């Protein structure tokens, strides 16, 4: 019980496909490109996360002021509640002061 | 990424193999055998 009786299908991986063979290309677009572009501009994803890093409270605060006016009502309400909970935890709870 | 213990079967069998010759439920039930295997050692 809790462990499969047969072996799973083999995990075949192509180490020489397009995405793996061309990974890391254009990471030095600035050094070798006269600094016309910055490597952070090659990052794709959420517009509030491009070239930026923070903790959950910092991520949640940043998302609310950048796309908060476009969010669904239920998702926005939960975001505000998450910011309230995190504000209390980080600023009032912990081992160190 | 969600990780789960996949080899919990082997972790408890290395305890129950020392309890096979015990009497009662403490020879097949980990909860009971672990406390009697530790006393045996």
């Amino acid at each position: 019980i809790g462990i499969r009786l047969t072996l799973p299908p083999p995990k075949v991986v192509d180490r020489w496909n397009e995405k793996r063979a061309m990974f890391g290309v254009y990471d030095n677009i600035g050094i070798l490109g006269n600094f016309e572009k910055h490597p952070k501009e090659l990052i794709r994803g959420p517009i509030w996360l491009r070239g930026w890093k923070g903790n959950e409270l910092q991520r949640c605060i940043r998302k609310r002021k950048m796309v908060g006016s476009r969010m669904f009502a239920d998702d926005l309400h939960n975001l505000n509640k998450r910011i309230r909970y995190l504000y209390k935890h980080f600023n009032r709870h912990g081992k160190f002061r | 990424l969600r990780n789960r213990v996949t080899d919990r079967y082997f972790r408890i069998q290395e305890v129950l193999k020392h309890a096979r010759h015990f009497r009662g439920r403490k020879n097949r039930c980990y909860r009971l055998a672990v406390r009697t295997v530790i006393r045996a050692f």
Partner: peptide
């Protein structure tokens, strides 16, 4: 179903040993 291969492979080896004991070869 849990993902992984090491535990399933290791469990097949114990099954083989158990099978050999129950039915030892000539």
């Amino acid at each position: 179903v849990k993902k992984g291969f090491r535990a399933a492979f290791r469990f097949q080896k114990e099954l083989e040993r158990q099978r050999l004991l129950r039915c030892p070869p000539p």
